[PDB]
Symmetry: C3
Subunit: 233 residues, 3 copies
């Protein structure tokens, strides 16, 4: 746009005369004022067409520079839409990420919990474990112990008990008929008091049998002693 010629005025004859250059005696008083006005009229008119043309050039000049800004406006709205668009995709891309992480922390809070609850059970179960093992180590009767280790119960074995690889006690000895009589308790020597007489006429003889009794009564002592244990009956 912007047409330069529109700004170029028409020049009109400067002359704005009168009865100086007018006839003398020919036309009406009124034609006089007319011709005269006629001249003023043409003049005011040429100035309108010049203002208009002026006015017109100016409105096209505004046009060319408003055009540059519309054009600039399109560029920035264009670039903003492209940015807005981009953004929309990313904000969405970020919101879906917050949510996807939400479920993972969530599930992983339930897991850490049942972790805490299960480590807990593991602890008291391992405590009474130690406790029980401790009990075991206080009284189990051991196979390497050098020292005597007693127990406050009775003991039953299987075949037999031994000492130093040799056996010394087996199952009970049956078939017995207990001895009756008094048991021998005290003084007793296996070395021969008694004996005789040679030919005799002094009887005694009692001596042999007196001792023989004390031999059976002491036998009723040993025998008895073993039965009370249980070695026999």
């Amino acid at each position: 746009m912007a047409d330069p010629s529109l700004n170029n005025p028409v020049v009109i004859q400067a002359t704005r005369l009168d009865a100086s250059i007018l006839p003398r005696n020919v036309f009406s008083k009124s034609y006089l004022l007319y011709v005269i006005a006629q001249g003023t009229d043409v003049g005011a008119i040429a100035g309108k067409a010049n203002e208009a043309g002026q006015g017109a050039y100016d409105a096209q000049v505004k046009n060319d520079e408003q055009d540059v800004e519309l054009a600039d406006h399109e560029a920035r709205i264009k670039q903003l839409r492209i940015d807005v668009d981009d953004h929309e995709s990313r904000i969405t891309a970020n919101t879906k990420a917050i949510t996807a992480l939400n479920v993972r922390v969530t599930t992983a809070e339930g897991e850490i919990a049942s972790l805490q609850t299960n480590v807990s059970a593991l602890d008291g179960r391992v405590t009474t474990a130690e406790n029980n093992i401790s009990a075991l180590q206080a009284d189990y009767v051991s196979k390497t112990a050098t020292t005597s280790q007693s127990l406050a119960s009775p003991l039953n074995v299987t075949t037999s008990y031994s000492v130093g690889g040799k056996k010394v006690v087996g199952a009970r000895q049956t078939g017995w008929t207990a001895a009756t009589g008094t048991a021998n308790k005290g003084v007793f020597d296996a070395d021969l008091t008694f004996a005789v007489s040679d030919t005799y006429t002094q009887s005694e003889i009692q001596a042999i049998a007196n001792a023989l009794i004390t031999e059976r009564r002491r036998t009723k002592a040993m025998e008895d002693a073993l039965r009370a244990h249980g070695l026999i009956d």
Copy 2:
């Protein structure tokens, strides 16, 4: 800004023409018409020029309108650019951070995974420990325990067996010559082997020898009792 004069029309200060005012018999015929033709010509050009200012004054009015809205456009476009650039920086931070969350969420998922395994493996080892710990308690001797405990096996001890704090059995007594004959363990009692006389009497001496043989047969019986077990050679 729209110039107000453009819309102001050239007030044609001069009445119509109409021949009656014209100098007749002085003017040529051709001038007569020229003066007429020039007549409406000055009106039509006025009109035309007045409407030319008209259109341009309108093109300016709109030009004013369009500039207030272009300025408006201008200011809101600037605004959006400023916020959208604010948005870009927030957006870009928000995803970097969520990328940053992710790495420690993974680092934690990875370790929780680790802990569930080891705790699972922990249960495993603990169950098995309780179990052979309950086998142990159910099959060991234990010092303290008042109810008699049977072994289900033969025993073997190192220098002896004691009861209530006293030795009762040892290694087996060695170097016995086994006896001979046939031992029996029927009835035996504190016999009146005696009944002696003033004179001798064979029947009564014999009773002595008779109770003597049972005696010895009674001690070999015994002797068989203690070797059978093992207390003796």
Copy 3:
């Protein structure tokens, strides 16, 4: 919109003034040139008025386009603004969620580390126990075992020893006496007899009080074997 009648040109109908048609015996030369200079100026103003009309036209046609374009620009600006304010809320919400998940995450991490401490520790007490019970396994006397068990201690028991569930050893039998003399574990005759006749016979008698002597001696042996075990006092 653009007034198209802006372009309609006025055509002057006054013919170019030939001076021969003017009344030169009555017209000063002054108003002869004036008169000539008026027609001329009038056609020219015709062209200037015309020009500023087709010019105001182009400005008005351009106003028309620019108008279209404007409203489009409004429209999009108007929508951009809607999409930004939406983003505004969403973004601020996402930032809020991100930091809220970070306290979530950070607390989560202390718990994982508190656990880790407690599970490694668990590992250790299981390892120890696992070893402590394995050591029991190898050294405990079995209540169930079939193959014989040896003890490398002396054994003390409460109240008695039994084999096959039968009492066999108990208290050591006290208030006893130690038979004095020479104990014989030597050769013991196969329950020999003796020989008894009519009259006395000294050899007939010495024989029995002889077998009497050894009878006791061997007895005494038995009693000694018993004390060195501890079955009797």
